Amino acid sequence: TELLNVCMNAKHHKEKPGPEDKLHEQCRPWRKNACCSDVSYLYRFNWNHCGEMAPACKRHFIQDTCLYECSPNLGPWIQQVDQSWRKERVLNVPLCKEDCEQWWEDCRTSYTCKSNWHKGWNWTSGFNKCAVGAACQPFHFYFPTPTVLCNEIWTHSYKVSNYSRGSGRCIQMWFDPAQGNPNEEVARFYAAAM
Ligand SMILES: *[C@@H]1O[C@H](CO)[C@@H](O)[C@H](O)[C@H]1NC(C)=O
Ligand SMILES: *[C@H]1O[C@H](CO)[C@@H](O)[C@H](O)[C@H]1NC(C)=O
Ligand SMILES: [K+]
Question: Is residue 188 marked as binding?
Answer: no
- Resolution, Å (one decimal): 1.8
62 alpha carbon to ligand 1 midpoint, in Å? Answer: 27
Question: Is residue 163 marked as binding?
Answer: no
Q: Say which ligand is closest to the CA of 94.
A: 2
Question: Where does residue 136 fall: left (phi above 0), alpha (psi -120 to 50 degrees), or beta otherwise?
Answer: beta
122 alpha carbon to ligand 3 midpoint, in Å? Answer: 31
Q: What are residue 112's DSSP bridge partners?
A: 137
CA distance 147 to 191: 24
Helix (H, G, I), strand (E, B) or coil at 127: coil
Which atom of ligand 1 is nearest to 122's Cα?
A: 1
Positive or negative, the CA dihedral 41, 45, 48, 49 is negative
Domain ranges of the chain: 1-194
Q: Strands of 52-126 (E only): list them.
A: 111-112
Q: Do 55 and 48 form a contact (C-beta atoms < 8 A)?
A: no
Q: What are phi and psi of 16, to 5 degrees?
A: -80, 155
CA distance 23 to 41: 11
Question: Is residue 99 marked as binding?
Answer: no
CA distance 74 to 76: 6
Question: Is residue 118 marked as binding?
Answer: yes
**Which residue minimizes the CA distance to atom 1 of ligand 1?**
122
CA distance 121 to 164: 33
Q: Do 138 and 104 form a contact (C-beta atoms < 8 A)?
A: no
Q: Do 17 and 29 form a contact (C-beta atoms < 8 A)?
A: no
78 alpha carbon to ligand 2 midpoint, in Å? Answer: 23
CA distance 49 to 72: 30
| Inter-CA distances, 40 with 43, 79, 85, 166, 190, Å | 6, 20, 12, 29, 27
